[PDB]
Amino acid sequence: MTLAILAVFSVALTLLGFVLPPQGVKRATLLGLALALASLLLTWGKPFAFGPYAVDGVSQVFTLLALLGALWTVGLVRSGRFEFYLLVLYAALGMHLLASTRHLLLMLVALEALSLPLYALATWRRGQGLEAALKYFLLGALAAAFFLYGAALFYGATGSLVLGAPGEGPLYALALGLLLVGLGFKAALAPFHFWTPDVYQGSPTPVVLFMATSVKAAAFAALLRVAAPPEALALLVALSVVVGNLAALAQKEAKRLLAYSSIAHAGYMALALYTGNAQALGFYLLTYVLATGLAFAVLSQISPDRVPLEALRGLYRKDPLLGLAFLVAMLSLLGLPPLAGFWGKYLAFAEAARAGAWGVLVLALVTSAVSAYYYLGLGLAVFARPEETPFRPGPPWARAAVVAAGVLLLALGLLPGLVLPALAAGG
């Protein structure tokens, strides 16, 4: 009954914004998200299904992650337009619906409901932002067409539109492929990656935070429901990680480089899809969401429009806590011990090796070592001499958020045997 809370708050605030100041509307949105998260906690171990809508461990964990990312990205945004919060609420409900169902068509409806408000949230009205929004909308509608024809071929290969049906040979394979195309585009996997660098570079940094956390979480949640063949999985992972890290090498801008890094990270997470453990993936995504939200909150404190690499430098001298947290996030995204990003990486690789994919796992690891070049060129740049760069050292809001994110990262890296025991039913 968390979806009920989400829908009630969205519909109410829609009209309430006429009599309420946008600040009051933002307060209301924050309260609703926190209350939904509290309900998710109190329902831990209470799987609940009504229709095709189903809340299980996966729904709980991934919607927890999405709610966290949405709370963080809303905290930063102070625009006096309550619609800029209505859209976030809509996207949150849509991603919950996406993660909580197996019905392909309801999955499509949830996809559209979560994706449309992001297209509008990508409009700071900066000229690049319109180009980004246009590329995003066009490629997203194309992928929606592909996913819909895949659902049709699924309904062709089997009498139902719900995943798990037995499935035919080549036609079922074709339907599975046509669903995987859209799901990977939404997960920023190569060779469907081209939109991600442009969109991350064009969209405002807090929005990109929201995206790179909640969108990736819900996307991998829905991916776990598919029975993706190992050869297709191998191809996606290889291309994604290779192109991501390589093209990230060439990037001069922090947001675009992070987009390519996120392509490589989606490639990594796609390994747990071999077995679909979802405990390994739940943990991985917990760590990655925290780290990326941290990094993008810092990038938002630096500049919403665009942050170059040199802007990151001197961040320690400016704010030591911010410099240290940014370093920790870069390391957790590199996947290095003793951090929870490393534990998520290890769990995904363990699922992959259990699936018996060796060459693919090796290539992923090589490309991950390649990623250390730019991961260090970001984390260590914090200590360089401050060049001319705009710096607004955040509110205690964002300071405490970034600090708590880094602390949770390191704590679950040191003792994953605390939360990892309850990513299943939740004992």
């Binding site: 067409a145 024809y149 659902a151 309904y155 062709g156 009498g159």
Partner: protein, 95 residues
């Protein structure tokens, strides 16, 4: 069965449209054609598997209408002040 093959053909036609068209609006139109090809495949398979693909396609139509509304609003906002819609005119974002 001819209907499902015809739907695949219409899908390919809409793909060619999306690739060839210079205008965002005509790209979106080709996308709508792809969506309707999918709806026809759904209707054939609903005739096969008992009518659920009909309600499916209905929901699909509703979703298509919503996304059309949103995308046309975006197209207008991007090319109201700006000149010719040609999508190659926006190349600022590069690798």
């Amino acid at each position: 069965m001819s209907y499902l093959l015809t739907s695949a053909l219409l899908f390919a036609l809409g793909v060619y449209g999306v690739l060839t068209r210079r205008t965002a609006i005509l790209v979106f139109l080709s996308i709508e054609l792809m969506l309707n090809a999918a709806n026809l495949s759904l209707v054939g398979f609903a005739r096969a598997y008992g009518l659920d693909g009909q309600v499916a396609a209905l929901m699909v139509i509703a979703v298509a209408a919503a996304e059309v509304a949103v995308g046309l609003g975006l197209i207008v906002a991007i090319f109201r002040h700006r000149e010719s819609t040609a999508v190659d005119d926006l190349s600022e974002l590069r690798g």
